[PDB]
């Protein structure tokens, strides 16, 4: 039961780990396409 | 916030989890004074004449657990100056440990520290959880020991990880003899740190051993020039590479054994058949002894010439490797799922230091 | 009373392929390094992956172990003494060792290991448990059949109330040595030059069949034919855990012909697919009688071997042999072996008794099951009063194991 | 019916030792059936919950507080043929 | 479906992992001030007494220092079967029998606490090269009557043994196992003959 | 937008504070310390640890 | 019904645009997310409604309301009452028959006047 | 805080309210 227990402790830290990463890198990309549509939106506000 | 402690044999690394590096970074060694009572870290290294300059830490085997005591105490109180009763402690453990050694870490962070939660994790899962990947083999080079831990799913195989003495220590003393070779003076015991200080500013890795020698021999082109301390500049050549050679071709320092490459491709092969494929497509790279520049391609095309053709090799080599293990530990201590997983006070108290084996993997 | 006690005591579990090393209550041994060693002519040894892989001049390949029990004492010394400073990094003296035998190991080698462990490891305690018993063990089973094929024999051990029916134990040749000198016939046959992986310098990717196109390695010194024997080895044997699967019933050429084939990718950067002579080898395990070497041969299949075992013991025994069947070693590991042993078993066995079994298939549970019930022996609260002390030593003398150790 | 070993369940002709048997559990945190499960201490004297496999872990989950198949167990457990255990202070 | 499983080690391999006790789980931030609010009692690496080894040696444990010079408690389980000791007089006035030798009683008997009276491990074990060739039923017979014979001359009683029910017994059972598939498939066959016929007798009684 | 759409993070569970004096579930703290406790006795015990830490720190 | 664990709106391009309104829920028996139409977010801001708080949404209308702070963050040292509630039990989409005896008579006491003209009345 | 006032009491220990 121990051994069954630690490898899927482990298998879910991993996992959770993974996760983590990609939603990191994924929130950095957002973030990037979130600056240029601000930008975008100022230029609007202004041209109306 | 949680404290994470990553123990090495040359260099601690500690700091608070979530951070991007660590906030303190000493050498791991104890000073007494021939005939405060005890300096750690770069304290005891500026008083070499008066103090006992003792390495606790061997081949990341912790062997006289006073001076690791007091080491984690420096650590506690003086690097990071937080109090060990008040925050969880995350310390880190070598591959292939033995028993005792986790139990004596156990008790000692709870009956001396009083800390309110402790984990030990294995420093090659670690590594692997900054390298952000499910399944691969963890290639770390400390100061003392080099291990190969291939890890599937994120539970390291006890079985195929393999021990390799070779490390950065013995590399410093490699190019300290190199360097006598040439002539260069650089046997004193002080003298050591400056060959370890050319060591990571020239060295390199070669990623064609006999075309360099061929071309460091043929031309001085490849020779650079380094400034001693006292104001002496030393130009070195051909040098560059064979220190750090010694990593692929061992019998250059005398030990009798594998290279790094053939090291990571036994453990792989120790491994079954199915999960070949995934390590080889996830080899990182953790550890100083790592920092040379090109490693990452002569590691890629010796194993390549190890492994089968129809195999895909790829080596993890992020410029941040250096840390990995601590940067795994702080993303680890920072998890909420991870939160579960804390040995608390009341389950020291109740089952003694034998818990760390019932909790931590 | 609690939970079992932990005192600290190591497990070695020293077989001929591999020996399997760590500390009581772990569920993993430390460290596995092959049994076989370097010996350069006490001679200089060799015992670890590190030191075994690398090229030596006038280095020798050779093993402590002889169809299952030491007969080299001096190698035997030496490979214990590596474990203890390179992987235990512990005092011998301070930790009690608790090791496996095989089933038919002799009074007077079991006295001369005793005697060893005590004269010259200054040991604190002492103990020596069956691999069958601690096969056993590891599966939660107090009674049972373990059915081990490791390198040198394929033998089914009856255990019963956690002790080893010594008469009931039934040994074939055919192990995973049959299996490696079968694929080195097989290449041999196909004129396949076995390249060992230390030779290659480099290689290039080639098509199937194709010459293969690689470089020497240059300054190579001269090697022992032991060690380029034992590196071919190696070889063979991954190529047996790759490609070789036992066929999910008796073989036919037509159904073998029938299934897709697989292709291996030999370290010269030779590859080719297989075909059916994949599944031929592995049958020999089960119907000897087709093997080339001896048609007229007296072996025994594994079923065979396990049918035979059971029969020699009492019959009210044998519902609880039958019942619990435990499959061990790392030959069983070959693809579909679990369920053609299976299969054959259940036509064979009398429907009177009830077959079951363990689902155990994974490479840690088959090879280190020994191991593993040894970590759990030695954690026993109760099995603390079975332990061989140095006092005990010293006054019933070398004899004392016969009587403390069943 | 043939005989079998205590840790199986006397429909296999085993004796049903009550130690090895998996029931149906409910926890306090989360308010949820985990499914079939054993209560075992461990080395520590740490009680485990060890769990069982089951095809219906879905429903069980589910369950609490007492669709064909979900009306099968839900009639099953109302006539309690279903050992179904829950929590409670001493 | 299954209302209850059962299993030794686990049920399957797709088995959910067991669910560890432990605080924290919600939170350090939550348990912070019951964990600082105690203080752990310390643990030792000390050596200990088991009263049920005889040669006194001392192993290690893991132990509270509060429970340092306790009596070990595993001693507890330590007691063997109750096995009759008799002396050399005693043998030669009611034990002797002309089919056993004595010390080949006496070796038997030393099997037998040895094993703790399980009999086919003391016949696996039985010298069958020094001493006669011995049935299991040869040793159970010997060793019961030895201690009804001790048991009457010394003091109660116990039951006899009956070695020839035991012996047709195994007889029976190794014919019922020797035989052939179709021996065996003829029997059952016969079984499901007789339940139809029986079922057609009893169906016919119904009906009247 | 993040006006009316603020990320906010969820709340912190609160530390469930115990008493240093009888080791009950805390239900008050003492202005002056801001220490929690459970009972008069506990109130007292508190200042007067208090005043005995006053006068020995100055 | 459940604890709101986030509020995170989906944006998107229009054919800021938001096109969904995520709420995550939790309850004992565990968490859900609620792909909710976007014009929930005004009911939202009316209700105060904001990480912790325990609410319950009806299929029908779709408007939120909101019962009260989830008794998991209530310290023993703040004083409100009304603002806590302990999390809901059961799963956290629930299906609930209310079934009400009533006779004619009260239908038409109801009805006859209905419950500054109450004030006065 | 409370822990600059008060000794933490041992595990199986009835507290008393021993102070620094
Ligand atoms: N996955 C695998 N597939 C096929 N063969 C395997 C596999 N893993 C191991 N083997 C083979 O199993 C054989 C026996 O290994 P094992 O570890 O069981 O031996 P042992 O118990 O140490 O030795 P022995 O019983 O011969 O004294 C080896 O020859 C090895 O090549
Ligand atoms: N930029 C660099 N290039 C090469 N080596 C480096 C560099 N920086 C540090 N090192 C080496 O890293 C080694 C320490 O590695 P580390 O992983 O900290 O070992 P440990 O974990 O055992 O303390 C030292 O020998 C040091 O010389
Ligand atoms: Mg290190
Ligand atoms: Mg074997």
Redesign the interface.
């Known amino acids: 039961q121990e051994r069954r227990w630690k490898v899927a402790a482990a298998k879910k830290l991993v996992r959770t780990v993974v996760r983590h990463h990609e939603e990191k890198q994924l929130r950095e990309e957002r973030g990037k396409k979130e600056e240029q549509s601000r930008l975008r939106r100022i230029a609007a506000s202004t041209a109306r | 916030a949680a404290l994470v402690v990553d123990n090495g044999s040359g260099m601690c690394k500690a700091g608070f989890a979530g951070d991007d590096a660590p906030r303190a970074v000493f050498p791991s060694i104890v000073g007494r004074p021939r005939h405060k009572d005890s300096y750690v870290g770069d304290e005891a290294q500026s008083k070499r004449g008066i103090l006992t300059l003792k390495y606790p830490i061997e081949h990341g085997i912790v062997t006289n657990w006073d001076d690791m005591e007091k080491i984690w105490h420096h650590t506690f109180y003086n690097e990071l100056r937080v109090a060990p009763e008040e925050h969880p402690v995350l310390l880190t453990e070598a591959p292939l440990n033995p028993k005792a050694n986790r139990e004596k870490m156990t008790q000692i962070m709870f009956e001396t520290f009083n800390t309110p939660a402790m984990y030990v994790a294995i420093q090659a899962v670690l590594s692997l959880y900054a390298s952000g990947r499910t399944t691969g083999i963890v290639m770390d080079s400390g100061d003392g020991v080099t291990h190969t831990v291939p890890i599937y799913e994120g539970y390291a195989l006890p079985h195929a990880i393999l021990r390799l003495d070779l490390a950065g220590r013995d590399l410093t003393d490699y190019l300290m003899k190199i360097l006598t070779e040439r002539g260069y003076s650089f046997t004193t015991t002080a003298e050591r740190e400056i060959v370890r200080d050319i060591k990571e500013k020239l060295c390199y890795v070669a990623l064609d051993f006999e075309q360099e020698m061929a071309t460091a021999a043929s031309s001085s082109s490849l020779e650079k020039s380094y400034e001693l301390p006292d104001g002496q500049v030393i130009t070195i050549g051909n040098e560059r590479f064979r220190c750090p050679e010694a990593l692929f071709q061992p019998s250059f320092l005398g030990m009798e054994s594998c290279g790094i490459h053939e090291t990571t491709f036994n453990s792989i092969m120790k491994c079954d058949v199915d999960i070949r494929k995934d390590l080889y497509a996830n080899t990182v790279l953790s550890g100083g002894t790592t920092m040379y520049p090109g490693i990452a391609d002569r590691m890629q095309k010796e194993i390549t010439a190890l492994a089968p053709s129809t195999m895909k090799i790829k080596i993890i080599a992020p410029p941040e490797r250096k840390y990995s293990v601590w940067i795994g530990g702080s993303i680890l201590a920072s998890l909420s799922t991870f939160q579960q997983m804390w040995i608390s006070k009341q389950e020291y108290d109740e089952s003694g230091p034998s818990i760390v084996h019932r909790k931590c993997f | 009373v609690y939970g079992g006690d932990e005192v600290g005591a190591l497990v070695f579990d020293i077989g001929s392929y591999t020996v399997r090393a760590g500390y009581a209550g772990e569920d993993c041994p430390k460290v596995d390094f092959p049994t076989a060693i370097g010996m350069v002519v006490g001679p200089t040894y060799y015992i670890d992956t590190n030191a075994l892989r690398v090229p030596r001049e006038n280095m020798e390949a050779i093993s402590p172990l002889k169809n299952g029990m030491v007969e080299d004492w001096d190698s035997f010394q030496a490979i214990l003494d590596h474990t203890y400073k390179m992987h235990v990094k512990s005092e011998a003296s301070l930790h009690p060792v608790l090791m496996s035998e095989a089933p038919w190991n002799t009074r007077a080698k079991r006295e001369k290991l005793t005697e060893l462990m005590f004269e010259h490891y200054n040991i604190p305690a002492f103990f020596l448990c069956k691999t069958a018993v601690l096969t056993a063990f590891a599966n939660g089973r107090s009674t049972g059949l373990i059915l081990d094929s490791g390198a040198t024999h394929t033998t089914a051990i009856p255990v019963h109330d956690g002790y080893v029916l010594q008469q009931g134990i039934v040994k074939s040749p055919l192990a995973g040595d049959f299996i490696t000198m079968q694929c080195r016939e097989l290449f041999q046959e196909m004129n396949i030059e076995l390249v060992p992986p230390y030779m290659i310098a480099s290689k290039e990717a080639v098509r199937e069949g194709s010459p293969a196109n690689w470089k020497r390695k240059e300054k190579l010194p001269q090697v022992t034919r032991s060690w380029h024997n034992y590196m071919c080895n190696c070889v063979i044997q991954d190529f047996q855990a790759s490609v070789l699967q036992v066929s999910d019933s008796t073989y036919d050429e037509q159904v073998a012909a029938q299934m897709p084939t697989v292709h291996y990718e030999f370290p010269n950067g030779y590859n080719c697919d297989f075909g059916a002579e994949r599944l031929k080898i592995p049958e020999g395990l089960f119907d000897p009688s087709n093997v080339k070497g001896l048609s007229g041969n007296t072996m025994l299949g594994v079923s065979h071997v396990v049918t035979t075992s059971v029969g020699m013991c009492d019959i009210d025994i044998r519902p609880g042999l039958y019942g619990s069947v435990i499959v061990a070693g790392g030959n069983t590991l070959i693809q579909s072996f679990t369920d053609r042993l299976n299969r054959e078993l259940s036509q064979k066995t009398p429907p009177s008794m009830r077959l079951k079994l363990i689902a155990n298939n994974t490479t840690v549970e088959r090879r280190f099951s020994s191991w593993i019930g040894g970590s759990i022996l030695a954690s026993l609260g109760t099995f603390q009063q079975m332990w061989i002390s140095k006092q005990e030593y010293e006054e019933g003398g070398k004899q004392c194991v016969e009587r403390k150790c069943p | 019916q043939t005989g079998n070993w205590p840790w199986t369940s006397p429909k296999d002709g085993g004796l049903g030792d009550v130690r090895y048997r998996y029931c149906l559990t409910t926890l306090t945190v989360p308010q949820r059936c985990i499914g079939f499960a054993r209560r075992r201490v461990g080395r520590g004297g740490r009680v485990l919950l060890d769990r069982a496999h089951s095809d219906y872990d879905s429903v069980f989950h589910h369950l609490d507080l007492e669709s064909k198949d979900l009306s099968q167990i839900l009639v099953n457990i109302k006539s309690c043929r279903w050992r179904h255990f829950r929590p409670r202070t001493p | 479906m299954h209302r209850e499983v059962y299993a030794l080690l686990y049920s399957d391999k797709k088995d959910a992992p067991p669910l560890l006790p432990s605080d924290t789980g919600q939170g350090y931030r939550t348990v912070k001030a019951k964990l600082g609010s105690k203080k752990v009692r310390p643990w030792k690496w000390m050596p200990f007494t088991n009263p049920a080894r005889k040669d006194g040696a001392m192993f290690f444990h893991w132990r509270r220092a509060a429970e340092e010079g306790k009596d070990y408690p595993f001693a507890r389980f330590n007691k063997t079967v109750q096995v009759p000791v008799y002396s050399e007089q005693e043998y030669q006035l009611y034990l002797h029998d002309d089919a056993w030798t004595k010390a080949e009683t006496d070796h038997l008997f030393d099997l037998s606490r040895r094993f703790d009276l399980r009999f086919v491990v003391i016949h696996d074990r039985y010298d069958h090269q020094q001493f006669k060739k011995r049935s299991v039923e040869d040793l159970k017979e010997r060793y019961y009557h030895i201690c009804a014979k001790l048991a009457n001359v010394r003091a109660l009683k116990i039951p006899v043994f009956d070695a020839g029910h035991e012996r047709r017994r195994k007889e029976q059972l190794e014919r019922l196992y020797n035989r052939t598939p179709e021996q065996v498939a003829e029997e059952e066959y016969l079984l499901q003959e007789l339940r139809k016929i029986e079922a057609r007798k009893k169906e016919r009684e119904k009906r009247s | 937008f993040e006006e009316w759409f603020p990320q906010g993070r969820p709340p912190k569970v609160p530390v469930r504070e115990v008493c240093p004096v009888t080791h009950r579930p805390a239900l008050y703290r003492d202005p002056v310390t801001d220490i929690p406790y459970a009972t008069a006795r506990a109130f007292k015990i508190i200042r007067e640890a208090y005043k005995k830490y006053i006068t020995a720190h100055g | 019904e459940g604890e709101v ?5 989906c944006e998107t391009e229009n054919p ?1 645009t ?1 096109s969904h309104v995520i709420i995550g829920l939790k309850t ?3 968490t859900k997310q609620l792909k909710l139409d976007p014009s929930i ?1 005004e009911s939202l ?1 009316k209700e105060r409604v ?3 708080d325990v609410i319950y949404i009806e299929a029908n209308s779709g408007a939120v309301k909101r019962q009260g702070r989830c008794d ?6 703040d004083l409100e009452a009304e603002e806590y509630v302990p999390l809901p ?3 956290v989409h629930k299906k609930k028959e209310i079934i009400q005896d009533v006779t004619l008579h009260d239908l038409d006491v109801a009805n006859a006047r209905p419950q500054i003209l109450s004030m006065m009345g | 805080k409370a822990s600059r006032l008060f000794q933490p009491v041992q595990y199986g220990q009835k507290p008393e309210g021993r102070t620094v």
């Open positions: 664990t986030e509020l995170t709106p800021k938001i004992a028996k565990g977010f801001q904001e990480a912790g998991t963050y209530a310290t023993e040292f039990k059961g799963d």
